[PDB]
């Protein structure tokens, strides 16, 4: 699966957390609600920096918290 | 504005109340598409693109003794809460007398026109 | 069933229901045309609920059926298509005990119910002893070959001669048989009932 | 009744008499009962006469006595120690009275 998000942190090495956000209708009201999730994606090349809107795909579990890897960078920067 | 379609609709509702010959409303393809059904259905004489520099839609309203051609007209689908109806969901305004304009992939059409084509969409408003 | 003085029910309902000697000048409704009791004289005061109640009452009393099945049959006829009122009588008129009565095998519905229970009546050959049996069109209702001798049916069928039968029916006094042509419409039936009133009562 | 139970047993604490309210006047027979529910409420004693002592122990039905504010329950006669009314030729269903020969 592919997920789009922002690089909210590049503190760790080879590890970048992507803040993916989505919009879903409320099961009762139906009005769209905002929901986000942080995913620790792998980045061996430490190519992606903070502010980068990258794509994320499911991959072989690098660690317990990391099960995703950086595929491609959408845009350059957006702080 | 926030909901141009509602504005236009209101500007005609308030214009007819004062029995004005014509009324202006900021142009927009969607608006024109709507005005098209209003003229064909017989709610308005017609319309015309006006404006020296700013595109407007001069709506020529018409009236009759006793009742006004457009007795009622209100937007049911608003930006705050959009509404969508299926082919069988299309409600009949005043058992046929009145009609409703829906926006489908086939284009803007009335209940009967949409019912015939066999498709549903966003219920723009009721007249 | 009810089982008791039927000649009193006729007075209460106001109309003359055919329970037995309704033909004779005895039927109390001929002597005193007022409901039973020490108050059948004083002027009665009926309400909207009263007219609907007494209405279905006489209806059910005619066929002499319980209030349960009567209600059950009502629900059914109300489910199927077509005017409920019409269908109603159709079902009740479909009862075996009722058919037998219409055919003349029995003096009354009560006696007809007995004949059925006594296995003295057959349907398309096989015998049926259930008064609640629903007779469909094209079904032949004749007397039992063994019962063909009992004086009771002998006298009943004898009086049947020359007597006309309903359009939805057709009997053969000779063979002592009967056939259910079709479901009787409200036009065929001449009951002192106002189907429009009985349907309102159950509305509630 | 606590456990939403139709009835509830209990032991009488005292079988005294009470006087109706403003509009009525009499010596209605009541009795404080310590139900198994853990509550000590007052119940009315229907009938013209009863045989409830201190260790009566009777079942409670539940019913408010308009005249006696506080009495929200009625004692079931014909059960436990509460003997059914004597010579009750009428509504024997209540007061628990066997039909005489």
């Amino acid at each position: 699966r592919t997920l789009q998000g922002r690089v909210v942190s590049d503190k760790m090495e080879k590890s970048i957390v992507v803040a993916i956000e989505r919009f879903v209708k409320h099961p009762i009201y139906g009005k769209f609600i905002k929901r986000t999730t942080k995913l620790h994606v792998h980045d061996e090349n430490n190519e992606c920096g903070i502010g980068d809107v990258v794509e994320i795909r499911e991959c072989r579990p690098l660690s317990k918290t990391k099960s995703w890897t950086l595929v491609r960078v959408v845009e350059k920067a957006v702080l | 504005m926030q909901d141009p379609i509602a504005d236009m609709l209101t500007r005609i509702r308030n214009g007819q109340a004062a029995n004005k010959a014509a009324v202006t409303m900021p142009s927009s393809k969607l608006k024109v598409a709507i005005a098209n059904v209003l003229k064909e259905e017989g709610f308005i004489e017609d319309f015309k693109v006006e404006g020296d520099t700013k595109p407007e839609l001069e709506l020529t309203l018409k009236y009759f003794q006793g009742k006004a051609v457009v007795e009622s007209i209100q937007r049911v689908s608003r930006p705050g809460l959009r509404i969508y109806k299926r082919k069988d969901e299309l409600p009949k305004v005043m058992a046929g007398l009145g009609i409703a304009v829906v926006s489908t992939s086939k284009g803007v059409m009335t209940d009967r026109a949409a019912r015939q084509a066999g498709l549903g969409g966003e219920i723009i408003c009721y007249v | 069933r009810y089982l008791g003085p039927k000649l009193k029910l006729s007075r209460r309902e106001g109309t003359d229901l055919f329970l037995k000697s309704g033909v004779r000048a005895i039927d109390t409704k001929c002597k005193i045309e007022q409901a039973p009791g020490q108050h059948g004289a004083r002027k009665p005061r009926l309400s909207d609920y009263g007219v609907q109640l007494r209405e279905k009452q006489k209806v059910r009393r005619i066929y002499g059926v319980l209030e349960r099945q009567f209600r059950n049959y009502y629900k059914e006829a109300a489910r199927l298509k077509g005017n409920t009122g019409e269908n109603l009588l159709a079902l009740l008129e479909g009862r075996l005990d009722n058919v037998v009565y219409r055919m003349g095998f029995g003096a009354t519905r009560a006696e007809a119910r007995q004949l059925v229970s006594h296995k003295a009546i057959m349907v398309n050959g096989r015998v049926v002893n259930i008064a609640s049996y629903q007779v469909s069109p094209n079904d032949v209702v004749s007397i039992r070959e063994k019962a063909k001798k009992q004086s009771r049916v002998k006298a009943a069928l004898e009086l049947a001669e020359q007597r006309e039968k309903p359009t939805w029916l057709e009997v053969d006094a000779g063979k002592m048989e009967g056939t259910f042509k079709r479901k009787p419409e409200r036009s065929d039936l001449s009951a002192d009932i106002n189907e429009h009133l009985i349907v309102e009562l159950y509305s509630k | 009744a606590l456990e939403a139970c139709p009835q509830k047993r209990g032991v009488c604490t005292r079988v005294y008499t009470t006087t109706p309210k403003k509009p009525n006047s009499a010596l209605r027979k009541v009795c404080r009962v310590r139900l198994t529910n853990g509550f000590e409420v007052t119940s009315y004693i229907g009938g013209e006469g009863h045989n409830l002592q201190e260790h009566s122990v009777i079942l409670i039905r539940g019913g408010r006595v308009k005249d006696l504010p506080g009495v929200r329950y009625h004692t079931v006669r014909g059960a436990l120690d509460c003997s059914g009314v004597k010579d009750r030729k009428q509504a024997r269903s209540k007061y628990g009275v066997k039909r005489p020969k």
Partner: protein, 148 residues
């Protein structure tokens, strides 16, 4: 000819300098059954006097309901005072489903089938007024066409 239906009658009492003077009110519905309706509500010191006076008033104010196959031309929602009445055409076999107030007015109206319901105030006097008003606003495609 015209058939009358007694909707409802009220005792109606009032305090006056001298005591209580009773006056009975009565709602009557006059109709032939082929499209004409008539509502009447007159008072009188005597019940029958009010009933008759009512029938006379009912026949004086009649409406020509444009019936179509035992039904109406289109749904309507008339709102009299705090009372509200809604009407909706229906296929045959449905029957006149509505309160005693509206039905009685619809039966004589000639209506054979219709779906209705009472909203807001349930006042019998205000609902009958709302019903008749709704029967007036009723229009047919012929009228609308010739109207436009």
């Amino acid at each position: 000819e015209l058939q009358e239906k007694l909707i409802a009658v009220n005792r109606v009492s009032k305090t006056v300098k001298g005591g209580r003077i009773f006056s009975f009110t009565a709602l009557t519905v006059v109709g032939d059954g082929n499209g004409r309706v008539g509502f009447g509500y007159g008072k009188a010191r005597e019940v029958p006097a009010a009933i008759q006076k009512a029938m006379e008033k009912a026949r004086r104010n009649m409406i020509n309901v444009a019936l179509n196959n035992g039904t109406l031309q289109h749904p309507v929602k008339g709102v009299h005072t705090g009372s509200r009445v809604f009407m909706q055409p229906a296929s045959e076999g449905t029957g006149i489903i509505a309160g005693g107030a509206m039905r009685a007015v619809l039966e004589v109206a000639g209506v054979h089938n219709v779906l209705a319901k009472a909203y807001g105030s349930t006042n019998p006097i205000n609902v009958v007024r709302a019903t008749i008003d709704g029967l007036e606003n009723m229009n047919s495609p012929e009228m609308v066409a010739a109207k436009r």
